[PDB]
Amino acid sequence: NMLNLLIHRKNLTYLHLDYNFNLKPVKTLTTKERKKSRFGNAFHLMREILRLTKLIVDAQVQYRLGNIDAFQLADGIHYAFNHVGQLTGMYRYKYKLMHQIRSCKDLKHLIYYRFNTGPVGKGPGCGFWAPSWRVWLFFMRGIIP
Amino acid sequence: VPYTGENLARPSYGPANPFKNNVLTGHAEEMYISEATFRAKHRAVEAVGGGVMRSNREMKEVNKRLREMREDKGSATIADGEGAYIGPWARYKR
Amino acid sequence: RPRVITEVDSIPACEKWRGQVLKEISRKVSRIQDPALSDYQIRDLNDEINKLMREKHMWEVQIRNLGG
């Protein structure tokens, strides 16, 4: 609602923000409209952080509705914290964040190579999400000021 | 000096003008009083009953008539229907 | 706009028709004010201005008959 109010106060009502925090033009934009509607790194960074938060919250909502069970919830949370560069365009507005992405990838490798040993076959199912969740909390600690 | 009594006692010479205030409407100065003094004087002016000499028993009597003018408070152990608890949201009859 | 000016009795429709006729008359006067207009062009502009004035007069007559 804050992002929508900021869009509507600036009279950019030809931009639609959908509920997964994607900003798309509803029509074909002129040069003047494209120059007026070009948001900056603060708006877009905040939008992408809200998108990641929405993905996490929506995973918990899908668990609470009954559509997915707890193992699917944990695997989805671990997938989401490991695929911020794929599920968000968050890196486009703060590129040092790539470090965090790399960190999660490194953790994933270690976790995955200790998780699939013996009868535990490959595929989805690893819900050990705590290290990547830590990494993005420390990212938020840095990014708040 | 110039705070002694003989300095404050002497007047200003000369005649008086036949034809000052800090702000445009009057004179206002910063003052220091206790919070309780301002609250008590504001209460004495504000409360309808500031003054009018009255002891505890007839004040309780006035409270009793005021309470019986109001609606029934209800029973708090009755959760539904007539007799349900209304409480401080009971209005005064008029 | 409707062809039957006298049949129009609505005040807002007559006012809108009169405003459109006035805008057309102003556009015709602005076109006639252009020096590029030749004798045929000036005659066409004068005829358009006269037609717009007649339409505005009919709309105003209908308005004065039925509100305005």
């Binding site: 106060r9 009279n11 009502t13 | 036949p18 034809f19 | 004065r64 039925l66 509100g67």
Partner: protein
């Protein structure tokens, strides 16, 4: 007595969006956007209620509180609360005067008017004149205007510029003028029309100009006469010959041929030399 009558039922009174004049509803400005600008202001619709003072008046939860303003929506005929409204639901009387910062409904008055001259109004003109137009042009305009522009207050002067369908109603009270403007806007007189009751500008007629200038002058004179003592002002005009004789005899103070100046004689204070006050 009589409680305030609920005008419109709450089932018909909601808080919904305006009719769709665009593609996207702007929620910051609460206005439709998109479409074409040929729509723009479009037209002024017909309002959802009129007022009967003899039928809709009563008491609210405002007669108990001194200083309560009148109700805008009771003046608009669409107030559903009735006796539970926090504002007055009666007609403004002649003693219902207000300061030059608010109207009779409590809305703040502005420095200057708006170009589309309506709204609350400005405090830089004590405007008791309401401009009504969009009247169905007939021959009996004056009678129906005097019948229907009469239940809102006490009226000084209605000049009906007939043929144009325009009238200028001047009430004796500014609060009554504001009440009439907020009550008759988008109403019907005899046929289905939308009245454009707006704030009147200034009558260029020099007779009206000198009337307004004079009325301003005796209003200020009334204020000055309230300020000054009765003997002082009675000497000030000097229409009474006895007051003139009192001025000649009193403004001597021993020295003959003085005729003391008005700064010295008409002076108020503890140290003045006069009966003072």
């Amino acid at each position: 007595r009589r409680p305030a009558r609920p005008q419109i039922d709450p089932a018909l009174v909601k808080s919904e969006r305006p009719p769709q004049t665009g593609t996207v509803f702007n929620i910051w400005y609460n206005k439709w956007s998109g479409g074409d600008r040929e729509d723009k202001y479009l037209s002024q619709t017909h309002a959802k209620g009129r007022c009967n003072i003899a039928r809709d008046s009563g008491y609210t939860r405002a007669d108990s509180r001194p200083g309560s303003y009148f109700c805008l929506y009771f003046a608009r005929g669409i107030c559903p609360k009735g006796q539970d409204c926090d504002y007055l639901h009666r007609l403004p009387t002649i003693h219902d005067i207000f300061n030059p910062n608010v109207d009779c409904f409590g809305r703040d008055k502005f420095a200057d008017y708006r170009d589309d001259m309506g709204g609350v109004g400005s405090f830089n003109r004590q405007n008791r004149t309401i401009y009504v137009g969009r009247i169905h042009v007939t021959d009996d305009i004056e009678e129906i205007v005097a019948r229907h522009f009469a239940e809102w207050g006490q009226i000084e002067r209605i000049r009906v510029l007939n043929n144009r369908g325009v009238a200028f109603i001047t009430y004796t009270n500014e609060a009554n003028a504001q009440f009439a403007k907020e009550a008759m806007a988008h109403q019907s007189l005899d046929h289905n029309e939308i009245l454009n009751v707006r704030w009147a500008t200034a009558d260029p007629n020099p007779l009206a100009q000198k009337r307004e200038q004079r009325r301003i002058e005796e209003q200020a004179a009334e204020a000055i006469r309230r300020a000054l003592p009765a003997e002082f002002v009675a000497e000030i005009e000097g229409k009474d010959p006895e007051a003139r004789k009192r001025r000649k005899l009193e403004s001597s103070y021993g020295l003959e041929g003085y005729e003391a100046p008005d700064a010295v004689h008409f002076a108020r204070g503890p140290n003045a030399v006069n009966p003072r006050g």
